[PDB]
Amino acid sequence: RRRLQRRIAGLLPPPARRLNISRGSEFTRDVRGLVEEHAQASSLSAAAVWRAGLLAPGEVAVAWSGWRPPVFGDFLIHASSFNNAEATGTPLFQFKQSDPFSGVDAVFTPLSLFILMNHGRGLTRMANLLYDSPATLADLVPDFGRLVADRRFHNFITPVGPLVENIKSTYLNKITTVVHGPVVSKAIPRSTVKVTVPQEAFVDLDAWLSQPCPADARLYVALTYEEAGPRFTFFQSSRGHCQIMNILRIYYSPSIMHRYAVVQPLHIEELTFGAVACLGTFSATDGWRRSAFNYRGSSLPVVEIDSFYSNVSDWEVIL
């Protein structure tokens, strides 16, 4: 019953919430013990692993903290269906193939997903520069035109979130994407990763309206059905999902009667005007710093959502 006292001693101490520091230049051990968050990658020695403490159950502790470990979904795609000059921080989209036993999936980055839309009818210059032939991508979906024609394209693509690591294989490329959690790279210098989305495809919804500012302003994807070929736009907002559907209806108010005027809805399935999905949250203050993205020839403008927290949801239809 005295061993229970040692057990409650090993179980008590929470992470340090307050710390009465005195001066800054002293750098006490207690404030170091507050600010030291354990690592994830270390050299391979049993003493080095013990100081890194990776053997601790669930969360890391040297023989809970409001922090979540990220999961890493793995995918396999053909080498021509992807360009190895893609950025690290770019969101990806899985298209479910129609074979029952598949093994090799089919993932589309928005640059690649653009040329599934343009062929059949700046940014499109780069999308044709990187993925040169649409025919190498027009076949990963077997029946694209029929699936657009009955407007069930959105429930076949589930977003998988941003990319992390691309081991540039020869034929069957293996990519790792974070479906959930803190988006952080698996590198030996563990460098920060910023999710990028191309600028012309990404319209802000905050300054589109031109006092309550929260910390987590979410990022929304939206596939929309146009008679001029469907479009993938992205959305930054600091609102609730209840607000995001109404303000997206008001934002798409020209395009709905555009499609209504050009194509009359003859059947009953064309009335779905696309859907939305929360891709996750990030910091509302330091959001969406612009940057540039060079291939060997050209440069498209591109946003950089920095320190992103990925969280996929399902599809909620715009109407």
């Binding site: 669930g58 809970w64 979540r68 470990p69 999961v71 890493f72 979904g73 793995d74 995918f75 899985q94 479910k96 193939q97 129609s98 074979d99 029952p100 598949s102 999936d105 429930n155 589930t158 998988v160 479906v179 959930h180 108010s253 709905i256 009667m257 209504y260 809805p265 009335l271 996929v312 949801s313 399902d314």
Partner: protein, 290 residues
């Protein structure tokens, strides 16, 4: 934190039957340390079968995978929305899972005898979301089409509703179903009340939509779309009544709004569980609460 739950109670064939499903999930009664038999999954609700109460009970309590079965205990861990788990597709209606597909939990519509263990313990079905909503639609239209041919044989045919309702389809997977071909009228079947909600809301939708358009169009222009989409309905549903007792009309409107919201919260499948990387060779999948 601490996640284990040790519940107290079996024999050798019970050991084998519970050992068959050591990767499946089932709900609990409370998030405590020790519990009894009665607090386990779907026992006190499913023994008259009724779907909407069981979906409410499944969204009510928490969920738990089980880990090990002893002679007198079942070691099981409840799931928390913090961290991730590893569960299995070890259900006798075998729906093949896929990568980054969201998994659902619906109460068992595939008969008692498939997803059960006779000691009682009733496990819920786990299956992905498009298969979930499609099997919901294809069991609901099966219900109303069975009730119609039990009422009127000249409105539909039995093989007419088995060429298109006995099978679900998802990425080439053309499964079959165990449809209850003899439901029996006056309720008394599973999904007897959900069709009875669906018909009432689809009956009160004209009285709702016309009253809403006539009440919204007098506020002259917040938007053009309420009159822009006046052409897309048929004119048969346009000129219906425009006059009723507003006591009766208000009561009908309140009941249709309540039943609509309950039905729309049920058509959302419930506790959505998200996968990350499924492995069919191991029959396991990374999963976490959403």
């Amino acid at each position: 934190m601490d996640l284990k739950v040790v519940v107290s109670l079996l024999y050798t064939d019970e050991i084998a039957k519970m050992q068959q499903r050591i990767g499946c999930i089932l709900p609990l009664a409370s998030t405590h340390g020790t519990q009894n038999v009665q607090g386990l999954g779907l026992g006190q609700v499913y023994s008259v079968p009724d779907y909407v109460s069981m979906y409410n009970y499944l969204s009510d309590c928490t969920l738990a995978v089980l880990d090990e079965v002893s002679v007198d205990s079942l070691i099981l861990t409840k799931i928390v929305p913090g961290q991730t788990y590893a569960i299995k597709n070890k259900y006798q209606p075998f729906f093949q899972w896929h990568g980054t597909g969201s998994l659902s939990v619906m109460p068992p519509v595939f008969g008692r005898e498939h997803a059960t263990v006779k000691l009682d313990i009733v496990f819920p079905m786990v299956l992905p979301t498009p298969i979930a909503e499609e099997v919901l639609q294809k069991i609901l239209l099966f219900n109303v089409y069975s009730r119609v041919v039990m009422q009127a044989p000249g409105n539909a045919d039995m093989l007419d509703v088995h060429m298109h309702l006995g099978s679900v389809s998802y990425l080439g997977h053309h499964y079959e179903l165990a449809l209850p071909e003899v439901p029996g009228p006056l309720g008394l079947a599973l999904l007897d009340n959900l069709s009875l909600y669906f018909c009432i809301m689809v009956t009160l939708l004209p009285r709702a939509s016309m009253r809403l358009v006539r009440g919204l169009i007098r506020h002259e222009h917040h938007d053009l779309l309420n009159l822009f989409q006046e052409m897309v309905p048929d004119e048969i549903a346009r000129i219906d009544l425009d006059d009723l007792s507003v006591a009766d009309d208000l009561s009908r409107m309140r009941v249709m709004m309540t039943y609509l919201q309950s039905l729309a919260s049920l058509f959302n499948l419930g506790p959505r569980l998200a996968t990350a990387a499924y492995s069919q060779e191991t029959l396991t999948a990374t999963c976490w609460l959403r």
